[PDB]
Write a protein that binds this ligand. Structure first.
Ligand SMILES: CC(=O)N[C@@H]1[C@@H](O)[C@H](O[C@@H]2O[C@H](CO)[C@@H](O[C@@H]3O[C@H](CO[C@H]4O[C@H](CO[C@H]5O[C@H](CO)[C@@H](O)[C@H](O)[C@@H]5O)[C@@H](O)[C@H](O[C@H]5O[C@H](CO)[C@@H](O)[C@H](O)[C@@H]5O)[C@@H]4O)[C@@H](O)[C@H](O[C@H]4O[C@H](CO)[C@@H](O)[C@H](O)[C@@H]4O[C@H]4O[C@H](CO)[C@@H](O)[C@H](O)[C@@H]4O)[C@@H]3O)[C@H](O)[C@H]2NC(C)=O)[C@@H](CO)O[C@H]1O
Ligand code: NI
Ligand code: NI
Lengths: 158, 158
């Protein structure tokens, strides 16, 4: 089981970490949503799908930088909504093909009432997402860590 | 690491169970030997030998049906004799090649004094043997269970 990003960065069998740089709306008003759709960035596959089934969860998700200070939000995993920063591990998603398939995660972040000015500085870490892989054959519990960085500033007009 | 039989039946990575039907000597006299050579039926391989070596043992084995009722015997594992039913684990056999190589197990059974008539009925379960795989790389401890069935009657003439 391994995972790759869009621009090529990869995390091998056994786990590891990588940096994903995401584009954000340059301007977002209080009450609007800022969307980070990782389903178009992170892709994972099962290296022996014929006999084995891979199980993937969001073990935790955490907010950093300006998203922590100036945003509320939720994460949507495989059809269901959960708070972000995360308060529990999510249900499992199955990976059963050697073909790279997306990780169905999306962050919805909305500036809070007191938000104003520059709320996210470009290049800064805005979240960390921990993907947990297990399977149906052994006790493997692997962590694929994704450090999410902003490609641009985000301004919340006041 | 997986194991296959000659007739196609297989147990995949991680372990499992299977039913193996073996041809038996149609007739065996008291004082003669009945031989069940699984080394010519079960074969196992190592799927990544470059970094890891797989360790295989005969963990335990039990007799059922006519082998339980009408035969005494021992099991021979990789050149050495052991009690049957086996209540203790055997030394290890090494697997470090992708080439299918035999599981060196063979049962040597002799009819008991009172044996006479059909002593093994065709189609019946005659034994259960548990192959245990471990390795030098992971915490993998898998059981490949082999349920041994007789393909034909066996008669002990009196
Ligand atoms: C970038 C980098 O180098 N990363 C490191 C990484 O390379 C390294 O480890 C290994 O990576 C190899 C990359 O291909 C792996 O090779 C393949 O293995 C497949 C089987 O994988 C399953 O089995 C392994 C080994 O464990 C089992 O087997 C051993 C051996 O007996 C035993 O001890 C165990 O108890 C158990 O029985 C597991 O590790 C795998 O687990 C991972 O994947 C599963 C599935 O997603 C997860 O559930 C699990 O949690 C792990 O994430 C699997 O369980 C082979 O099927 C595969 O076969 C093809 O390629 C070889 C190459 O020659 C051919 O010879 C072979 O015939 C076969 O070819 C066929 O199939 C190909 C595609 O399938 C096709 O292209 C061919 O044309 C042909 O059709 C291959 O051998 C290797 O398994 C990895 N090893 C381990 C231990 O993970 C790791 C290790 O530290 O570090 C990275 O950094
Ligand atoms: Ni792969
Ligand atoms: Ni194999």
């Amino acid at each position: 089981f391994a995972c790759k990003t869009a621009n090529g960065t990869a995390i091998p069998i056994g786990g590891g970490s990588a940096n994903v740089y995401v584009n954000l709306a340059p301007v977002v008003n209080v009450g609007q949503n800022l969307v980070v759709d990782l389903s178009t960035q992170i892709f994972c596959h099962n290296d022996y799908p014929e006999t084995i089934t891979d199980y993937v969860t969001l073990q935790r998700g955490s907010a950093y930088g300006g998203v922590l200070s100036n945003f509320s939000g939720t994460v949507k995993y495989s059809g269901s909504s959960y708070p972000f920063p995360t308060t529990s591990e999510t249900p499992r998603v199955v990976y059963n093909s050697r073909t790279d398939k997306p990780w169905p995660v999306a962050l919805y972040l909305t500036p809070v009432s007191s938000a104003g000015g520059v709320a996210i500085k470009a290049g800064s870490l805005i979240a960390v997402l921990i993907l947990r892989q297990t399977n149906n054959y052994n006790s493997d519990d692997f962590q694929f860590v994704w450090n999410i960085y902003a490609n641009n500033d985000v301004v919340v007009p006041t």
